[PDB]
Amino acid sequence: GPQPISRLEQCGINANDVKKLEEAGFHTVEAVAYAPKKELINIKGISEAKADKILAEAAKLVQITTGSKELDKLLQGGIETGSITEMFGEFRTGKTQICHTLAVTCQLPIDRGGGEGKAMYIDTEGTFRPERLLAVAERYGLSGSDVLDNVAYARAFNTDHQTQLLYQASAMMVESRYALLIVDSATALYRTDYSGRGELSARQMHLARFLRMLLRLADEFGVAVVITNQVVGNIIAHASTTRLYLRKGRGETRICKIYDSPCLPEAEAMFAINADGVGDAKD
DNA sequence: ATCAGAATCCCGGTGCCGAGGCCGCTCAATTGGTCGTAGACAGCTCTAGCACCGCTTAAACGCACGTACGCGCTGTCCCCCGCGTTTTAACCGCCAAGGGGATTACACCCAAGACACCAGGCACGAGACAGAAAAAAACAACGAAAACGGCCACCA
DSSP, rough: OOOHHHHHHHHTOOOOHHHHHHHHHHHBBHHHHTTHHHHHHHHHOOOOHHHHHHHHHHHHHHOOSSSHHHHHTTTTBBOOTTSSSEEEEESSSSSSHHHHHHHHTTTTTTTTTSSSEEEEESSSSSSOOOHHHHHHHTTTTTOOHHHHTTEEEEOHHHHHHHHHHHHHHHHHHHHEEEEEEETTTHHHHHHHSSSHHHHHHOOOOOOOOOHHHHHHHHHHHEEEEEEEOOOOTTTTHOOOOOEEEEEEETTTTTEEEEEOOSSOSOOEEEEEEEESSSOOOOO
């Protein structure tokens, strides 16, 4: 399991550097330990000596239903909790709608295709709609009020704030059982904030650390990690376990394709976006 | 070199007013004496200024080298000088008034001087923390160089 980074301070790293590592997004001794020097050195206010002391002392210690049946069949039953699933597609393909649906379906019983856990929605694009959650809850006959009470929401205003929210998420996810973490327009803030060409490496480093934190939290709490990417990077390939390409079919019916999975076939499934739900196409 | 004209120097004459001298007076300098005190001198202490040696190391020093700056030259143009003409107000003399500066006299209050006292300020001690030093580090800058971009040439 995890070895929260608090124990690293007893090794004799000073507490200010541990706070800086947690701000950076490293929360376990496992997390600090199996990374090279440059990650910690690149952090502001950290020299090579502090990074070597950290790595040295660190080595001493160390299926949620989509609600579309056709999509569930495409995924062999739904998202694997504990792994990152990326859905890259054009605008209006339904990424946000699918997120809203899953935010409620995660709370469904496991026998009903849920994870029996609370949901986490990190929004970067303003598209969060509690009424959509209420509609999905009423579809499956779930209490809309309890759904909103089991969905914690926060809008990330930038990439640094997007990563900073993970620090609150990790500690909050310890006290209550969650099953779903949603990050909507996860890559948009890395395009709006870092728009220049000389600043590309900075956003790439921040995104890499963010993805590593996602994988770490997924393995730590066994929750499903859902991130959305707008296609108007090869780094995401290693981080995402299942890549889904989404494209619009005219009207409100969307085509889903699997474009890489070591376990899932390359295959396609047709689904629709209905007021209640993300739900199978019904010609 | 020349020569004309403008400026300066020199020589003499006339006048005038300020410098030099004389006389009365008065008060400021002189003389003699007295008395308090300040500084001249003796003497003692002990501070610190000087002398020296040794070690270290940072600053000085000599040299090589490259280039930016001082300097000379040239062209241009502008604005100041010099000179003639018009204007104005500075100046000289003369008068009027009043106001303020100087003078004298009287008064009183404010400050020196003395005394008695006492508390604030001033050596000594102590402790403790801001800053000096050291070290690491961040880092901002300088600038070689190069990579890009842009600009031009020819004629098609």
